[PDB]
Symmetry: C2
Subunit: 378 residues, 2 copies
């Protein structure tokens, strides 16, 4: 059997031809394709202004800057996320504050978020882990009551909805990633959804060195911007992906259903492998995240992953707890501070989930997980 | 006649086919193409370690961080450059210090540079404007005598040499850009050349969030890194460009020679249009930069550029003086501080120069410049 990675993009020949056209045109960096992609994303978001960038990390940072976040301010987020989520807070000069996760959803616990608010809090970065939104009504009730800005880390949630409305069409500032591994890709890239045109102009300034050009020779810099513009090659890939979004999301929901059906009654389930929430309305099923019952295994997580690889199956880790990293320990974080995120971060494994998978592939994965639990379970 | 832009890339069919193969492979972000591109660049640089990035701006900032530059430190650079050159200094917390240009070369005046050294100076960022190196012997004599690090802003100078040695193979930390408009492109991208493998490891950490992965599930962050990795799509373009480097540089040299021959004795020269240095050994002729004699024209630079456009010729501005921008005026900079860079910044115009140009195109451009000077000269 061929090796089964945990993700793989699905890029059609029409999109590849589009990229060829862009390269042959000689107009290869930011240009008409980016304009078209911004317009398409804006219409997807119900007409809200959208600006595209070379990642879904800079979008977070720029969101914070638009919200006025800087030295002396606190921003609350989750430790169960990619480290950029809190590193961007540090980049602004602000102080990252963590709140623990709900062990069932693996997302930030909204009661713990509320409990972390102080007079210094200025913004919140919720993460939609696996593409699963939090309770968006509750999130914004908290933000409204405490007069906080929200920069949604929807990196994984392009195509997700909350009670029938799109992530991106609701809320405050919304950040998406189009990394290769995401449900829709531009190779690397991202987008920020704004509330109004003034915020979009500021976003544009931060995107490229704070520079505004006017006429043939007018130039000024009024903002300390960075280097964050997206190429037209990348934008063309995004434009080619968009018409497939609905189908991709449906495919991923079908695969997730197949996982639950396959796991039911097996050795892994019996041993205590922890499955994600079985819901098929809101999340876009970007990943299939399970937890190993470490106390009931005679092998480490690393060994478990090695055993999956021996069976030809790739796995990942999304994610170890941020606050236990060396840089964060130096800021004053320790074990015991976020027990749910710490248990999750030590035990989580990412199983294959991508649009070209078959039900057979799902059964192969579950077979391997069962076999390892049967052999090595206490 | 068709419109003549001031630049256009030259991307061949083998390269485009290569990008097609990368996309079909599903390995689209950082992977084996980036590894092969780093190896090729290392070879070009005489075996020095090289790391590639998503721009030639982050490479400058990372070079400063490797050099230990931060709050309280001064870094000397030129105001006649793209604003990222000094914005990266501010990003680190350090203080930018400007030194004026030599009006003949348009590069930083090394005596003015030396005059700007204080006990707070930690590093220098010379710019090789148009791809023209400074006197590299004098530059490093200064750096050694004052125990300063050098982060070369060689954005425009890939393929430039000094006394027959390659820019990149000499010097301290060397930063290149592979933007669409540069003599070799990766669509967008850059490279940093290091002195040793410890520097290269630090560069890698800064490249992607400070994260090191070990084994199946080991992960740590010990540095505040950013989001700066290059895609395999981009690296494949760079690999396809590299075999053309010598030919591209020769073509640009021949076009520059043709400009000098075409301008010689005409109305523009008589009025006072100022040409770049006529040397064909060191610089890679990335741009052909002229200065308008504004005191001898009845029209503005902007009107001069509009008149060129009426004649089907695109032009650019590289660059207005940085210290007169709003952000820099707020730091206390003002007119009269850098007279050569101010005069240059107000009067410079970029004429077409790219590998697919003909001798006829050069003559068309010069005809237009002569005609405008004849009409609007006083």
């Amino acid at each position: 059997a061929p090796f089964l990675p945990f993700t793989r993009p699905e890029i059609d020949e029409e999109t590849i031809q589009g990229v060829v056209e862009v390269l042959r045109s000689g107009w290869i960096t930011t240009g008409p394709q980016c304009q078209k992609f911004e317009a398409a994303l804006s219409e997807y978001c119900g007409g809200r202004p959208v600006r595209v960038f070379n990642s879904g990390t800079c979008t977070l940072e720029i969101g914070l800057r638009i919200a006025g976040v800087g030295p002396g301010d606190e921003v609350i987020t989750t430790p169960a996320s990619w480290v950029s989520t809190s590193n961007v807070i540090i980049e602004t000069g602000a102080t990252p504050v963590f709140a623990d996760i709900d062990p069932v959803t693996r997302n930030i616990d909204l009661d713990k978020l509320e409990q972390a608010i102080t007079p210094r809090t200025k913004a919140i970065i919720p993460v939609f882990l696996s593409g699963l939104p939090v309770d968006m009504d509750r999130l914004y009730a908290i933000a409204r009551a405490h007069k906080l800005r929200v920069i949604e880390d929807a990196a994984q949630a392009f195509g997700s909805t909350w009670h029938g409305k799109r992530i991106g069409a609701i809320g405050d500032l919304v950040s998406f990633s189009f990394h290769a591994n995401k449900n829709l890709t531009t190779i690397e890239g991202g987008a920020l959804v704004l509330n109004n045109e003034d915020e979009a102009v500021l976003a544009q300034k931060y995107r490229l060195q704070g520079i505004t050009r006017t006429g043939f020779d007018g130039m000024d810099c009024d903002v300390l911007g960075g280097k964050y513009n997206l190429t037209d090659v990348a934008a063309r890939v995004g434009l080619g992906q968009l018409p497939h979004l609905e189908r991709f999301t449906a495919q991923r929901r079908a695969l997730a259903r197949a996982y639950f059906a396959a796991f039911d009654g097996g050795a892994a389930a019996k041993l205590g492998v922890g499955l994600p929430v079985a819901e098929f309305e809101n999340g876009n099923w970007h990943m299939f995240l399970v937890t190993l019952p470490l106390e009931r295994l005679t092998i480490t997580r690393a060994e478990f992953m090695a055993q999956m690889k021996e069976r030809g199956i790739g796995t990942g880790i999304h994610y170890p707890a941020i606050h236990l990293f060396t840089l964060y320990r130096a800021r004053g974080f320790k074990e015991g501070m976020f027990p749910h995120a710490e248990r999750y971060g030590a035990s989580t494994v990412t199983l294959p989930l991508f649009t070209q998978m078959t039900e057979g592939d799902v059964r192969r994965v579950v077979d391997a997980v069962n076999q390892i639990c049967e052999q090595y379970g206490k």
